[PDB]
Scaffold this motif. Structure first.
Motif, PDB file in Angstrom:
ATOM      1  N   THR A   1       0.818  -1.209   0.000  1.00 30.09           N
ATOM      2  CA  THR A   1       0.000   0.000   0.000  1.00 30.09           C
ATOM      3  C   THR A   1       0.857   1.267   0.000  1.00 30.09           C
ATOM      4  OG1 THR A   1      -0.280  -0.125   2.421  1.00 30.09           O
ATOM      5  CG2 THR A   1      -1.997  -1.105   1.047  1.00 30.09           C
TER       6      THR A   1
ATOM      7  N   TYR B   1      -4.572   0.101   7.563  1.00 25.75           N
ATOM      8  CA  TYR B   1      -4.069  -0.948   6.667  1.00 25.75           C
ATOM      9  C   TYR B   1      -3.718  -0.394   5.271  1.00 25.75           C
ATOM     10  CZ  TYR B   1      -6.709  -3.603  10.234  1.00 25.75           C
ATOM     11  OH  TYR B   1      -7.238  -4.077  11.411  1.00 25.75           O
TER      12      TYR B   1
ATOM     13  N   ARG C   1      -0.157   1.678   6.463  1.00 25.00           N
ATOM     14  CA  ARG C   1       0.935   0.844   6.974  1.00 25.00           C
ATOM     15  C   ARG C   1       1.153  -0.346   6.032  1.00 25.00           C
ATOM     16  NH1 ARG C   1      -0.328   3.067  12.535  1.00 25.00           N
ATOM     17  NH2 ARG C   1      -0.063   1.208  13.857  1.00 25.00           N
TER      18      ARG C   1
ATOM     19  N   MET D   1       0.507  -4.556   7.097  1.00 26.22           N
ATOM     20  CA  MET D   1      -0.873  -5.034   7.206  1.00 26.22           C
ATOM     21  C   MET D   1      -1.570  -4.934   5.849  1.00 26.22           C
ATOM     22  SD  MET D   1      -2.325  -5.487  10.647  1.00 26.22           S
ATOM     23  CE  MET D   1      -2.697  -6.813   9.499  1.00 26.22           C
ATOM     24  N   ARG D   2      -2.199  -6.021   5.406  1.00 26.31           N
ATOM     25  CA  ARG D   2      -3.001  -5.983   4.182  1.00 26.31           C
ATOM     26  C   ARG D   2      -4.409  -5.488   4.511  1.00 26.31           C
ATOM     27  NH1 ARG D   2      -7.080  -9.839   3.714  1.00 26.31           N
ATOM     28  NH2 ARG D   2      -6.674 -11.894   4.655  1.00 26.31           N
ATOM     29  N   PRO D   3      -5.087  -4.856   3.535  1.00 23.63           N
ATOM     30  CA  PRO D   3      -6.498  -4.525   3.738  1.00 23.63           C
ATOM     31  C   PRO D   3      -7.355  -5.783   3.835  1.00 23.63           C
ATOM     32  CG  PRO D   3      -5.582  -3.329   1.849  1.00 23.63           C
ATOM     33  CD  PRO D   3      -4.591  -4.381   2.231  1.00 23.63           C
TER      34      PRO D   3
HETATM   35 MG   LIG Z   1      -0.794  -2.542   3.662  1.00 22.67          MG
END
Ligand SMILES: [Mg+2]
Lengths: 243, 235, 241, 244, 250, 228, 240, 111, 231
Positions: free
Chosen positions: C7, C118, C121, C124-126
């Motif tokens: 992301t 998410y 950062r 962390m995946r959505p």
């Molecule tokens: Mg992410």
């Protein structure tokens, strides 16, 4: 491209390829099944005899959680063991705080959330097992099946491994030809048959059958291994059916 | 790029195998074990004549009964020596005794594979660890960055090693005297060294039960070099 | 091409992982719908049990978050349950810390903030889910608040989610263009559920049996889901009009 | 895992250069020019705001010149936000020193600490460096009036006259030509403005595109005063030195 | 697990560009137009409530937010990023100021704290920059009225009047023509509405426009009486009706 | 550090020729108040061990839960959990003794005195004691609290040394235990009439007797006692 | 914390980050150390592209670590400040615990250890710095001169040079320095140091810095004119 | 207030001969004025021809002996089954005891 | 290929290449054989030297009085895993006064190895182990693979050319399982099994390593002169 190189990356179609690759390891494993009966559940699994040098009866695959839950899995065996160890910690902490032994649906979500967590980061690998598990609680019998994605549902019957297609079809017949119920003792015999029938797809090696069960009437709601005479009986029932 | 702890398809750790290449570039070090003592000798290999060669310290005392010579990235050896000295002294504090040469060697080798993403890479230096203890007598070990150590009757490490090791295969026998062993180290160093061997660009040491680990003065080594010249100019 | 995998911004100021998380939202091939009555909020969702070996009572995408708040999810079940567990923990903690029940819109904001994190950062995946929260709030009355993987959220008069959301949406818009009010002018929740099912039938062009639907109802001081037999009773009354 | 996306901000090139430091310096070369000139009786700091709009509020704006304490000021060239992080750190260091020793911090000690912070970002932590170059103008009772510069590498040096930002090559040549050791502040003011007037990329130099400051002993009896110029005062000095 | 992204995701490219900041600014360019105008006796900030669907209740989505009783904020770019910044801005106004000095921070200092948060997201490990530009308007005793812009990099600038997002270049030109140092607040509101009409496509009314002012103290919004020195918030959000009233004499 | 609140008094035990006997009353005292009357303080672990506990009841219930978790954990991945790899009295005792000493060494003791009674795989009698200090010892007779002062003397008349054990039958041993419980009821102010008794025999296995009462009590001589 | 292994072996057994750190040293201004019979001299080049420099306040190239030991360097200037600070702290720590100032070899061994540690620690790059450490052990009149480099190896030198064009001045010293006959006086040793620098420096202006260190904490920096006298005297012997 | 120590009585005696050594001790274990056991062994064979007794507070004595026996076992693993000399055992026990200098093993040890 | 850079990555067919590369290190290791009767269990291991001046690498490690193993592959990894086993056997004795069942020892090794196959930064163990022991349920032989897979066997072999010995044991199964109360015959059969893996080299007095554990026999290792009897 390169979307499949890292866990927790969505592809442009919205898929996690690493989880789908974990399924391939599951599909490559030995066949394992679960059958829900009237007052309990039956678990069975195919153990391939790699060589005569394997001590018979001694490499047990089915695993108990607490005293009322059975778990069997197909795929990477160590991953399954790791998942059961976690399950045992979750069951212990639940009973510690709430006194009562963990309900099966509660236990299913505990494993579900833990397996799902291993699809959120690239620093970990997804579980290479599908796990069939269940048992008896205060609301009756429950059978669940849990995939590498963390996805799980309740089942009437369930199958995974290399012979899952054959076993499914066999399970579908039992469900249709017994819409009112199946007894624990029947289910043990049927489990033996379905494993023997599913063994067609792993025919190069001969195998060892292993069964367990939790039934409110037959085992007092506790998980026990099917041993001795009752095991031999179910082996005979199965052998007569393949001829 | 690629992990530091990665295996190759042949089942070897890339970083360990690469550190072994760094050791082949190092200056030659030789050790020979006898029933009268263990001799340790090194090639100093000063990079320029203005470098004061006696400040090159490639043979080192670990305890009174254990010495050690190095070859490869010699700066990497300092923390290994520090650990070895600490382990030897610590054991004496806990047990009121000298520590076995093998146990010391094993303690050093435990550091080797403590790397990843602990230190960031393997050590780029090999050690010859020589010493005496009561149980197993005079001993010589070869400690690698793979964490493996072998006991040897005689061993050569560094750039001129397989040439020297072939020579040690011929010359070593169980009845070697200490004096013969000294001449043999000098002889083989002279063979594989680039520059001409003398007391300023090569160094000897030994470990005996009676006198412990001793590095030889340049005057004492000079005498042994002259003795070596005379024996070879006699057939 | 690594701005596609984590992301971070693409050269056109886009977050591709968020966009692909929106696509995962329709993996289940299920459509849902939420509407508000005078005294209630109704949420309905398609129920599809394709395998005969499944226990259909365990197949569900509607969750009871608190006694007052219900949540329906559009997306894969593992991410759905992840969000469900978290929302339950958040709602319970809120009540403990502040001494009153967490409002539906506040929970929606909280889960939307978590989703935003998410998207910012990298580690962390959505979550590939769209969360629709429903309740009868004690201050704002009947409420529908919907959250998506981008961390966006907003209140709704009514809403729909899934592959065929647009057909259901336009169907609902046209009704409210007629009625000229913010809600279904109906006393009983039974009749609001009947409205919800009726307008889904028209929009999708499909008929439903009792096992093809899942229904959640929010009233003052409790949210509950209907059994197959309560839904059957609903279907029967629809047919007889 | 995560290694794949690591740019490795703190590594040498095969030539022995720090990529990120070099590229940060390239960023700074596009910033508005800042000039510092040191005299015997004071110091001048002059800096060019980057291309202005008529709607920008000038009289309340501060982009280039910052007060670190009563005796020390800095001119900034590069990313303003990065500079403010470091400036507040420097302000705190100055007060820590004053609290500890009951004496105002010597100019070099403050400069060294900030430079050491910049250096750390180039050797460890895996973070990008600060895209900022400073000119430090200050006074203490040991060395008197002092000028320093520091850049993203964390290297600092002292100067009689120096420029940072855009067109430093041209600016340094012009200062090198007209600077003299016996020079006074009022001459240094004129030199700084004339240098900016010639090196600027704008059509002409005007009050609304400048920030200006002096550190003078010009304060009743043995003591130092900092003067950040108001817009009207910059307009007056531009007229007075015959540039408008 | 553990966050193992401890390295910068924003780095200098060979040409000296910080890629992620530029790309963040590109996201702001796509954003809906918002603007601010400073008058002699107040400040106005405005933007378009572009509703995603007509079933959405757009009053439940607040683009203009109260940060303190005398400070407000509007944005262009990514709404969710804005929402979390507002939460952090409100909290930092208390933790690093009000709990220390017993009063709300002045506009410039709160802007400074918001800017710092945004800067850190441009250098810290494992994060991307915020994809928003803020316009923060406010009043305080010693500085009077002020208007600031804050960008993804953490840079902030004071403005007399400005616009950000979609049609900012055209809007800034419009504002250069009309702005003078003698504007009263009503004149500034009128100009804000005229400016905003250009970048708005379809419906232009009180329900599609969000507009707030920093103006006179509102004792009627304080919630209590009996302390002469506490006179109420200067931030006020104009109602849908109040906006439509001013759209007739437009 | 704490103080015991709700407490249980003596636990008494002895070895006989083919096994062990253990007994303990069913009272939970709250100081001098006899608050709780239905408290079971003998906890059987499997079919070859009985753990008798005195002292703090809340800590007893905690220990009770630890032993219950031991059985669960021992059965994990253990096909011989009900055979060669079942829990032995010696295993259960050592585990408790480890915990008790660890807790005292953290200055946070489990305020108990414990006797583990059982029969090992090879038929050997097991009888060992442990308390809040982690102190352990074995003897042909063992008793906690008051029982140590009054029961041991009586039980030691039956089995005075190791060589007396083969000569002592289950009936003589049980009779001695039951007599001791009567004496404790006469003389211990924090005792009750109701008690539980357990026998672990190498042939007949575990017998667990609940709701026993002290009987044949001599009180008649009290009528003749006048004044002071 | 940031953990990446930046210093790692390549297939040929080289650690490139350490080797690239040496390239940074090669680019740095030249430094030279020559030890006489009763002194050590440290000479340093200053690149002459910078005038308008204020030399009163500009960081000097030779740094006192203690009253009896000095350190000069070639390579990254900012990196050298970190080594100098650590060395200064360790020097005071040694006095505090051992009740004796550091020997020159001990201090060298310390700085060299720091440099080595940064070649096999996670999340750090090696120091782009080589040092020349010079002085006299307490209560001893034998001169000491050591060298360190980014890899962490160190050694003693009769005379040595580092930095750019050090090959050329090493050539000079290798044929102009006699081991049997060390520069017997301060004047003699300073001259040989100045000569070696003039092989490479450019102008003999304020481009050459010289520092003399004598026994018992006697350290002094020569100023422009004093060095200028050596420069003058050398060219007048050259034209011949 | 909780007292982590106690006194289990007992007496031990070690005598060294010309080519032998004895370590004796009574088998009685007590608290206050009661007898816990008439036969609770107090002197132990710890392997490598070493006998040990730690007298005083029995819980600490058992823990110490148990730790020392463990130390002998690990001496063998770590040092190629080398026999642990009595002098090396003494020095090792010193470190076990001093490791709890600020919460001592309340025992008088003899090997 | 694109999927073998670390242990945290499945291939498109569901394989873990780093684990398979760790398995490859075992195949390169020197051969070791394990076999058991009902009373005893034996390990035989061919030790490998570096050259004729060097010692022969020790292959057999004692874990407890009733348990020990032999190794093939990375020796330092065996030292880590055998040390872990020593601790677990030790914990079982100190806390529960109970000898650790050989089967539990297998389960603990499996779980220790598994954690290194599922997380970032780690690497799989590069060694295979044959574990013999005599516990409350008789004699046992286990085979550990660094994938985490542990298997209970009558007999087996691992390392280079183990296939020869593995077939020999598969033929002789019915005979060697009955060798009860005769330790020397069980060793003879193991030495005969390991001989089927030899080419070029043969069994000599500093080449061969034998270990045995059983009914009234603590785990003991035979090297040097002590194996002359069996060559
Ligand atoms: Mg992410």
């Amino acid at each position: 491209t390169g979307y499949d190189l890292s866990n927790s990356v969505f592809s442009p179609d919205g898929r996690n390829f690493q989880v789908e690759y974990a399924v391939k390891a599951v599909e490559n494993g030995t066949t394992s099944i679960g059958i829900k009966c009237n007052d309990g559940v039956v678990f069975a699994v195919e153990k391939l005899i790699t060589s005569k040098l394997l001590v018979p009866q001694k490499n047990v695959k089915i695993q108990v959680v607490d005293r009322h839950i059975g778990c069997v899995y197909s795929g990477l065996i160590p991953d399954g063991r790791h998942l059961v160890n976690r399950g045992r910690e979750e069951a212990a902490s639940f009973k510690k705080l709430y006194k009562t032994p963990i309900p099966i649906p509660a236990f299913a979500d505990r494993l579900g959330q833990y397996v799902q967590a291993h699809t959120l980061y690239n620093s970990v690998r997804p579980f290479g097992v599908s796990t069939i598990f269940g048992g008896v609680d205060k609301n009756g019998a429950h059978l669940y099946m849990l995939e590498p994605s963390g996805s799980y549902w309740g089942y009437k019957g369930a199958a995974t491994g290399k012979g899952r297609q054959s076993a499914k079809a066999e399970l579908e017949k039992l469900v249709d030809h017994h819409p009112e119920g199946l007894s624990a003792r029947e289910a043990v015999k049927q489990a033996a048959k379905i494993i023997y029938l599913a063994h067609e797809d792993n025919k190069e090696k001969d195998f060892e059958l292993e069964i367990s069960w939790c039934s409110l009437s037959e085992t007092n709601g506790l998980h026990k291994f099917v041993k001795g005479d009752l095991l031999q009986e179910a082996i005979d029932f199965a052998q007569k059916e393949i001829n | 790029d690629r992990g530091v702890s990665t295996f190759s398809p042949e089942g070897r750790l890339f970083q360990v195998e690469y550190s072994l290449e760094a050791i082949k570039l190092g200056s030659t070090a030789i050790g020979i074990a006898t029933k009268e003592g263990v001799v340790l000798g090194v090639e100093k290999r000063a990079t320029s004549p203005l470098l004061e060669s006696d400040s090159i310290e490639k043979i080192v005392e670990i305890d009174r009964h254990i010495g050690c010579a190095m070859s490869g990235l010699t700066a990497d050896a300092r923390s290994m020596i520090e650990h070895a000295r600490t382990a030897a002294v610590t054991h004496n504090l806990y047990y009121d005794e000298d520590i076995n040469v093998e146990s010391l060697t094993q303690s050093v080798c435990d550091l080797a594979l403590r790397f990843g993403e602990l230190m960031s890479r393997p050590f780029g230096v090999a050690l010859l660890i020589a010493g005496h203890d009561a149980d197993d007598g005079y001993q010589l070990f070869h400690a690698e960055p793979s964490g493996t150590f072998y006991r040897y009757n005689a061993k050569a490490i560094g750039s001129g090693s397989e040439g020297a090791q072939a020579e040690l295969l011929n010359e070593w026998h169980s009845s070697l005297t200490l004096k013969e062993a000294e001449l043999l180290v000098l002889k083989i160093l002279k063979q594989v060294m680039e520059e001409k061997l003398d007391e300023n660009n090569a160094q000897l040491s030994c470990i005996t039960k009676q006198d412990g680990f001793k590095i030889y003065d340049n005057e004492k080594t000079a005498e042994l070099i002259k003795e070596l010249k005379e024996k070879e100019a006699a057939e | 091409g690594y701005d596609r995998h984590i992301t971070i911004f693409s050269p056109e100021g886009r977050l591709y992982q968020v966009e692909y998380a929106f696509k995962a939202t329709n993996q289940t091939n299920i459509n849902s719908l939420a509407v508000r009555g005078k005294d209630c909020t109704v949420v309905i969702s398609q129920k599809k049990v394709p395998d005969k070996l499944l226990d259909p009572t365990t197949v569900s995408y509607i969750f009871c978050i608190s006694r007052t708040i219900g949540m329906v999810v559009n997306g894969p079940i593992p991410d759905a349950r992840n969000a469900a567990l978290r929302a339950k923990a958040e709602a319970a903690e809120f009540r403990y810390k502040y001494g009153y029940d967490m409002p539906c819109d506040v929970l929606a904001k909280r889960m939307a903030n978590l989703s935003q994190i998410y998207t910012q950062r990298a580690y962390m995946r959505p979550l590939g889910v769209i969360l629709t929260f429903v309740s009868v709030d004690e201050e704002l009355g009947p409420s529908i608040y919907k959250t998506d993987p981008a961390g966006y959220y907003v209140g709704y008069k009514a809403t729909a989610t899934g592959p065929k959301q647009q057909e259901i949406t336009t169907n609902l818009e046209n009704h409210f263009k007629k009625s000229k009010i913010d809600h279904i002018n109906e006393e009983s929740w039974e009749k609001v559920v009947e409205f919800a099912i009726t307008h889904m039938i028209d929009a999708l062009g499909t008929e439903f049996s009792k096992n093809d639907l899942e229904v959640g109802v929010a009233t003052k001081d409790k949210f509950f889901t209907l059994s197959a037999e309560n839904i059957e009773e609903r279907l029967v009354a629809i047919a007889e009009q | 895992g995560s290694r794949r996306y690591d740019s490795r901000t703190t590594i040498f090139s095969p030539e022995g250069r720090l990529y990120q430091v070099e590229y940060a310096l390239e960023s700074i070369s596009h910033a508005g020019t800042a000039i510092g000139i040191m005299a015997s009786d004071g110091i001048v700091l002059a800096a060019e705001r980057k291309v202005t709009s008529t709607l920008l509020e000038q009289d309340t704006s501060t982009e280039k010149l910052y007060k670190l304490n009563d005796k020390i000021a800095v001119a900034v060239a590069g990313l303003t936000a990065d500079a403010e992080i470091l400036i507040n750190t420097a302000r705190i260091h100055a007060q820590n020193y004053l609290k500890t020793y009951n004496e105002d911090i010597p100019v070099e000690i403050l400069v060294r600490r900030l430079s050491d912070i910049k250096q750390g970002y180039t050797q460890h932590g895996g973070l990008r460096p600060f895209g900022v170059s400073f000119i430090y103008a200050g006074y203490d009772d040991r060395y008197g009036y002092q000028l320093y510069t520091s850049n993203p590498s964390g290297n600092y040096t002292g100067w009689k006259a120096i420029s940072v930002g855009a067109n430093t090559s041209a600016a340094q040549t012009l200062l090198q030509m007209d600077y003299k050791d016996d020079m006074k502040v009022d001459d240094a003011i004129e030199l700084a403005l004339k240098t900016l007037s010639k090196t600027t990329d704008s059509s002409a130099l005007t009050y609304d595109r400048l920030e200006f400051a002096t550190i003078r002993k010009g304060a009743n009896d043995g003591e130092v005063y900092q003067k950040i110029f108001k817009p009207q005062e910059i307009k007056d000095i531009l007229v007075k030195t015959g540039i408008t | 697990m553990t966050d193992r992204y401890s390295f910068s995701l924003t780095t200098f490219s060979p040409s000296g560009k910080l890629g992620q900041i530029d790309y963040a600014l590109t996201a702001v360019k796509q954003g809906v137009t918002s603007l601010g105008i400073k008058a002699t006796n107040g400040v106005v900030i405005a933007t378009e409530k572009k509703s995603s669907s007509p079933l959405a209740m757009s009053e439940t989505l607040s683009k203009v937010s109260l940060l303190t009783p005398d400070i407000g904020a509007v944005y262009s770019g990514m709404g969710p990023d804005y929402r979390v910044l507002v939460d952090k801005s409100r909290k930092v106004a208390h933790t690093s100021y009000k709990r220390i000095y017993g009063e709300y921070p002045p506009t410039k200092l709160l802007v400074s704290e918001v800017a710092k948060i945004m800067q850190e997201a441009t250098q810290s490990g494992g994060v991307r920059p915020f994809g928003v530009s803020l316009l923060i308007a406010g009043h305080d005793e010693f500085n009077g009225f002020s208007l600031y812009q804050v960008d993804p990099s953490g840079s902030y600038f004071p403005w007399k009047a400005t616009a950000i997002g979609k049609g900012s270049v055209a809007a800034k030109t419009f504002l250069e023509k009309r702005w003078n140092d003698e504007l009263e607040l009503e004149d500034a509101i009128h100009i804000a509405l005229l400016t905003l009409k250009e970048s708005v496509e379809g419906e232009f009314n009180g329900d599609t426009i969000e507009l707030a002012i920093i103006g006179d103290e509102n004792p009627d919004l304080l919630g209590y009486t009996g302390i002469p020195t506490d006179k109420g918030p200067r931030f006020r959000k104009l109602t849908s009706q109040e906006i439509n009233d001013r759209l007739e004499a437009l | 550090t704490q103080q015991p609140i709700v407490t249980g008094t003596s636990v008494i035990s002895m070895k006989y020729d083919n096994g062990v006997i253990i007994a303990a009353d069913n009272l939970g005292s709250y100081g001098s108040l006899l608050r709780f009357n239905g408290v079971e303080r003998l906890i059987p672990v499997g079919d070859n061990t009985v753990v008798g506990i005195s002292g703090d009841i809340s800590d007893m219930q905690h220990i009770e839960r630890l032993l219950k978790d031991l059985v669960t954990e021992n059965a994990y991945d253990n096909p011989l959990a009900d055979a060669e790899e079942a829990l032995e009295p010696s295993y259960i005792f050592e585990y408790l003794a480890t915990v008790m000493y660890q807790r005292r060494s953290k200055m946070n003791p489990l305020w108990n005195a414990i006797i583990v009674a059982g029969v090992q795989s090879n038929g050997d009698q097991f009888l060992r004691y442990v308390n809040l200090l982690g102190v352990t010892y074995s003897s042909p007779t063992l008793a906690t609290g008051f029982g140590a002062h009054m029961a041991n003397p009586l039980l030691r008349k039956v089995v005075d040394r190791e060589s007396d054990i083969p000569k002592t039958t289950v009936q003589v041993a049980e009779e001695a235990i039951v007599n001791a419980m009567r004496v404790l009821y006469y003389r211990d102010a924090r005792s009750s009439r109701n008690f539980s008794l357990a026998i672990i025999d190498k042939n007949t296995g575990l017998t667990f007797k609940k709701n026993l009462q002290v009987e044949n009590m001599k009180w008649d001589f009290a009528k003749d006692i006048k004044g002071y | 914390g940031y953990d990446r292994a930046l210093s790692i072996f390549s297939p040929d057994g080289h650690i490139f980050q350490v080797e690239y750190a040496l390239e940074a040293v090669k680019r740095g201004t030249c430094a030279v150390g020559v030890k006489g019979k009763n002194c050590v001299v440290l000479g340093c080049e200053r690149r002459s592209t910078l005038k308008l420099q204020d030399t009163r306040i500009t960081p000097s190239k030779v740094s006192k670590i203690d009253s009896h030991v000095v350190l000069s360097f070639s390579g990254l200037n900012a990196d050298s400040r970190i080594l100098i600070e650590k060395a200064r702290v360790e020097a005071q720590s040694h006095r505090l615990t051992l009740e004796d100032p550091v020997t020159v070899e001990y201090l060298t061994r310390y700085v060299a250890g720091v440099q080595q540690r940064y070649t096999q620690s996670g999340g750090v790059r090696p120091f782009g710095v080589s040092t020349l450490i010079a002085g006299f052990d307490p209560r001893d009149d034998e001169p000491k001169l050591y060298q360190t480099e980014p890899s962490g190896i160190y050694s003693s030198w009769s005379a040595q040079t580092i930095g750019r064009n050090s090959k050329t001045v090493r050539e000079f010293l290798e044929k102009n320095y006699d081991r049997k006959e060390p520069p017997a006086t301060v004047e003699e040793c300073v001259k040989l140091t100045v000569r070696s620098l003039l092989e490479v420096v450019q102008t003999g202006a304020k481009n050459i810095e010289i520092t003399v260190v004598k026994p018992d904490s006697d350290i002094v920096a020569l100023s422009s004119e004093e060095i200028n006298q050596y420069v003058t005297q050398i060219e007048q012997e050259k034209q011949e | 207030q909780f007292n982590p120590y106690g006194d289990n009585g007992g007496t031990i005696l070690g005598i060294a001969g010309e080519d032998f050594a004895v370590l004796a001790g009574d088998t009685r274990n007590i608290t206050d004025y009661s007898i816990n056991s008439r036969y609770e062994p107090k002197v132990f064979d710890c392997g490598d021809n070493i006998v040990m007794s730690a007298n005083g507070f029995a819980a600490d004595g058992d823990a110490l002996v148990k730790r020392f026996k463990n130390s002998v076992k690990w001496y063998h693993f770590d040092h190629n089954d080398k026999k642990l000399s009595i002098n090396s055992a003494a020095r090792n026990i010193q470190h076990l005891l001093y490791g709890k200098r600020f919460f001592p093993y309340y025992v008088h040890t003899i090997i | 290929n694109n999927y073998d850079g670390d242990t945290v990555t499945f291939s498109p067919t569901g394989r873990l290449f780093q684990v398979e590369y760790a398995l490859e290190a075992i195949k390169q290791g020197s051969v070791t054989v394990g076999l058991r009767s009902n009373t005893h269990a034996v390990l035989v291991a061919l030790k490998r030297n570096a050259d004729e001046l060097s010692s022969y690498q020790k292959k057999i490690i004692k874990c407890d009085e009733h348990m020990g193993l032999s190794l093939a592959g990375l020796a330092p990894d065996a030292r880590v895993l055998s040390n872990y086993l020593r601790q677990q056997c030790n914990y079982s004795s100190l806390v529960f006064n109970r000898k650790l069942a050989v089967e539990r020892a297998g389960h603990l090794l499996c779980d220790k190895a598994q954690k290194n196959t599922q997380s970032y930064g780690g690497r799989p163990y590069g060694v295979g182990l044959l574990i013999i022991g005599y516990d409350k349920s008789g004699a046992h032989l286990l085979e550990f693979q660094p994938s985490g897979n542990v298997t209970e066997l009558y007999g087996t072999a691992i390392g280079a050319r183990s296939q020869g010995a593995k077939t020999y044991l598969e033929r002789t199964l019915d005979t060697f399982i009955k060798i009860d109360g005769n330790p020397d015959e069980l060793i003879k059969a193991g030495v005969e099994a390991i001989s089927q893996s030899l080419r070029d080299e043969s069994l000599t007095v500093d080449n061969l390593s034998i270990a045995i554990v059983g009914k009234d026999t603590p785990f003991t290792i035979y090297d040097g002169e002590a194996v002359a009897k069996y060559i």
